[model samples]
Target: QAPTLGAAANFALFTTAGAVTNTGLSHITGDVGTNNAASTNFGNVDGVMQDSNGATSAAAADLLIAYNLLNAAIPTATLAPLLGNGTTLTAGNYFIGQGASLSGTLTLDGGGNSNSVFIFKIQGALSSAANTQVLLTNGALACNVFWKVEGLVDLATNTVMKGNVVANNAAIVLQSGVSLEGRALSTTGAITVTGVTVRKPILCGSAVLTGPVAPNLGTVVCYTIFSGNGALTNAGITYVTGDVGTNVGLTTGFQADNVNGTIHSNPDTSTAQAALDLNNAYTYLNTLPTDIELLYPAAFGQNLVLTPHTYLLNAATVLNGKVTLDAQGNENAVFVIKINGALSTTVNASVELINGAIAKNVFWKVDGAVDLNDYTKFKGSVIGNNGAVIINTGVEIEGRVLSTSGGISTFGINAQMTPGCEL
Candidate 1:
């Protein structure tokens, strides 16, 4: 069985007694922490961070336990200090007598067993040459690979390493262009990364995850009904928990008694700002690159499962029934569905959220008109960029409905705007 990381598994980067610093943009996919100091100079990290907090403290203790376990593991083989020049090794505990220098490609074969574990225990510092790689083959996983370095652990540019690297009494430093599909942890020193990408694999005992960063909605978030340059019309009982208005035309028919926020019938200061902010948010959404494209827009939602990413629907979309947005376990996951054509939903169409998905984190950027038929259960912010947005009676919207240059008409809809700019 592969040894588990226990509590230390949650962090991809951590230092127990020093600061966690990044010189340039370092994209991290797991939590980062420093038990006695703060993390500084970083870009978008996928997970959370902690400084002098109980979480880091607990991780520090667990890291020590894991380190000891790796140290005490019986060395199945002892190799020379100079290694990994096209070295191919099987699963076992490898001991390097002193400092280790890795170059070229090092392949670890699992012999068709996913549970095979590979441990590298170096008596001194561990360094990797530029563009070197630790490649796993035959069902071997990054989570099952362990590296215990007793001294400083440094990697050259573009070094691709896998598994958790624990440096005792030293720092873990990665140069620019290094890609670590594992964790960088130090028990007594700092972690300095530059232009690196560290993605903590799914825990050795379990599975994987997905998604992307969400866009900031700004002040436009407060409005449930808005138009950047067209009229906003409503009929019947429309209950809204956020503001309603249009920046360039009249907002008519919706009663203020049923609204929980201010309504801008004419362009006011709030509407002006909302229109500006809405345009900003729309531009941001439009600029996001497409990760996956669903070819069958005619059969759009047949309970299809989509992980968080920018999805492209090239033609007019029709929602037949349900579409599941699976966040895979991260609540901060974002979903952006960019429709190149119009969007039309059948009656009773529903958007289902699962595995830590939230309505506020989903955005539907429709290029043409959007028509949500009666009793549709919508679950995201709809941005109709090129046409009007029409919500039929009994529609249940847990997010906002806005248009950049077209009219928005609603009838007996229960629409609410989830609070935004929650950074």
Candidate 2:
């Protein structure tokens, strides 16, 4: 089986414990990041920029894991006739004991199976001549192909390539006008690119396990509404179908005869313990490593379809229309959205789940306030940190509303607790 890249798979270009220098015009379709250097070392990137912050460090560590995994795979055979000009390769692990060089065209056939894997291991520096090309056919995917180089990797001018080139303890160089369909990553050396176009593969023939583990929710998972260190207030017929509690203050702030679940207030041991667990869960999510960093914009969740990944937003976000989360047939797949700022929804906004996506597996961790406008249909748990959670009139949430250090103010909200994560 092929090794999964985890968070490292999100970047089309990355360097661990090294710098990345780019020249001229380069179009990168995905994220470009470095673990040990600042984004300034990217040398004027034309696409998404990420530096060796906490998230980058986490991704770089995952890259090392993937690198070691690829290295540990037993070679199916050695390339007797080393790869060069006009070579046709199949799905297997090929080891190049000394080194490897490529020129002209190299065709990789998937044998009618898109999930077929191809791995090339080079013991020394891997070099490519000018104008080299790599072609993929028969349902081949760039994500399933891997190249593990023990030394430096050099791609000459105008070379078009597929698959990830992972160099161990060495640098990687790509000359002008090079186009790569996969990633160029190095473990311990710089990556220099001159006028290159790189894209990160999204549909890589099959789904692989990636990203951080889900946090344990404990008793907090049982509550459809929970407030930590704050008041839980409600108004006008709030119909909550699960446990509701407040950890700090009195539960008397709520309106008369509204909630359907057992209400636990201050001085209750269960509520206190749940609040403690909620605090731990909030902290865990706040520090969670990210996979994709999306820029903040005016409008979001309008006819947008997303897969399972960690999406980061630098600023406050607003949802206007419909957003669909597709699980792609994976029941255990997780989707985490981390908003560094507030999260608000326009009136009648809705979030839908399709393709075997369970609402329980989706988590929205907002550092700022959460404002669910009137008549909105939300699908995931709202874990708010240090801000007020205002659930406006006539909103329906399929998941929990747990706030830490913030009051949960609701008006006629219908909330139910879905199984968030297993114990």
Candidate 3:
């Protein structure tokens, strides 16, 4: 016998009036209906409000509708209003206010209660607050509830969620110990992964992989860096890395530059690389493409941001354009930012933490090169593309820099660490 679930009203959230036309991919069947029209027998599939065959709760169904509304950019004026920002909402039932604007991204912070569950009695869009992180208490995100929002959507450390994060206007950042269930999509923003594990379908505008890919002990850091002295050029860029990995890079034009953690790159292509960039340049590129040049920076002093959840990298945390981390003052800090996909910078993008940057072992394993000024200071191991390692004057280096190209340049490099060095 199939497992039992909650009430029928729970499925109210999955209500949608759009024609349920099969996009091509089979296996997914649902009822198709007109706007404002009730849809029963969704493709004769179960759990769609009518077919209560599967154990999927109607609550999960409602969540599915909420999820689609947000993904489709449904107007917020026709939905329910979530708890205001900074308000502590207890575990209970919430009626989606009629014509209630699901305008702002709503945050469902579970407060670490894995057994917590919330029921929404309405149909509309849902979004989380700006830079607002959702900390799950202990419940699953009801089906049909769309998870859409602007700015950065961070999952608090140790929190668990069961829904697809489709951040269209913002980025998604996941912290350590945070678990989620869904195919997370970031249309314009970035997705940052932290902690010791992560799942898949990670989309980002500017990504930071600071943890490990779950169930695999996989390092989110790109493990590759791209940089070329002969003018690098591409369509876009993206990357994933471990928090301690000192990785960095820059993009040009509609090119994409993907850098997995600890990887750095500074290609001089006539145009930027399209490998790491989000879909800004085009929509054809799916997932971090292959064969893109990468770089790994072996620098130690990388500053880590310690906020509500410092140790974790919440899912759907986006970083637009270029992101940088400066471990200048952090002599012994442990800030881990992990990602599962690609990370890149826009025309003028950057995300860096200056001062108080510290971690035991700094690393960069890029698909490109380790690009950095001769004056840059690092304390880790860089493994990636091999070309010419450029060293500048008064530069401090205390790590292992390995390139795939097999060439080194000490144009302005001062490998000697002295008590009194020029800044």
Candidate 4:
């Protein structure tokens, strides 16, 4: 007999022995649960939440039983080389000895059978490329499709997925703008999501915002530090790995030995040209659409891992600890964080990049003063439109720092400008 889902059937998302962290807005239609050393992070669930409670324990137990039942079931035949990618698959029990990669449009034809079940026993990881889609037709329902994955399961940005995904003991990462019509349940490792939409197939609709493109920094990209109409000052052993420029005001408080690249002063025609480009870049960033607007209070860097998206902050933003940016293997992915108010980092606060996130592709557009306090290790290019870009003692930046109309000040800081644009 096939094992039933039991209590686990009630949840649209579940993790038995891991945590769930959602950096962006997520909407779930069914109950969210975790058990046996797992926690639930920020998300808006239409149903109830169960975290390490009796209900969650019961659900996890049922999930384990269901997983074992599927694992024990014999496979009808070996699956195709790649499960989906413009391929039309019929309803059957398919077995994959290794992982599966899906891209393009995959059509699942149920052949007019509502009860037809399609079970995929994958021995390795399962991943979907960005913008990939899964389509079900001919009386097919998401409840009848099941995927038993032994390794990690990853879904890239803006992917439309279906079926009940049950990973045995591996991490499950769902990147930004993923819409799932079925459940995402993991047994062991954590399940990390950003701006995911989880709902039963019956209630699935338009979800996951398609953010606009990141702004292009013209000649401003050439400057490691630039102040268009303000001063450029440095103190204590400031090490700049890229070119430094100032167009209008005097460049003060820095020695030639401290900077690694050429310093372009106001009199230089090239510096003046770059300053004009800086203003254009700042305007481009400020006028772009605001994709995600969230109210983040002070000390906002606690256990946060953001995906590639345009984040808009109308209020001041603060970072107190480590903040990670996961790119989900998209090398050209862009992260634009727009701050309308002051941007500051406490002592020792750092920005970490993971999964092919380049420092050159990350951008911070701040309308107010940008302050990197003592011992702060930051990433991304900063476009300070209003106030100064102040790098305090022991601060480090892997990317550029520019002030469109304000000053650029540094002290004992390791600053570099890694210039590149997302294609």
Candidate 3 overall Cα lDDT vs. reference? 0.31
| Model 2, residue 193: C-alpha shift (Å) | 22
Q: How many clashes (backbone atoms < 3 Å, residues ≥3 apart in a chain or on different chains) does model 1 have?
A: 0
- lDDT tens digits, residue span 33-102, model 4: 6786544455324445677999888888898998998898788878764766678878777898888887
lDDT score, candidate 2, position 244: 82
lDDT of 2 by residue, 1-423 (tens): 678887787677888878787776565655687887864433222235768787577778888999998989899889843575777888888888987888889999999999888999899988888999999999788888899999889999999989989999999999999999889988778888988878676576434534356777888888888888788878777777677878888665454355556777554987888889988888888888876665533456655555677777768889887777767677777888888888999999999998788888888888889899999999877899889889999999998988887888888888877864333
Poorly placed runs, candidate 1 (over 4 Å): 206-423
lDDT of 3 by residue, 206-302 (tens): 1233322111111212222223223222222222231111112342321122221222334322113222221121121112232111112121112
Better of 1 and 3 by lDDT: 1
RMSD of each: 14.0, 9.2, 17.7, 13.0
Model 1, position 359, has a per-residue lDDT of 94
Predicted structure 4: clash tally = 0
Which candidate should be chosen as best, given TM-score against the real structure? Answer: 1
lDDT of 1 by residue, 333-355 (tens): 88999898899999999999998
Clashing pairs in 1: none
Winning candidate number (lDDT): 1
TM-score of each: 0.58, 0.55, 0.31, 0.56
Whole-model lDDT values for every prediction: 0.86, 0.80, 0.31, 0.77
- Quote the lDDT for 97 in model 4: 88
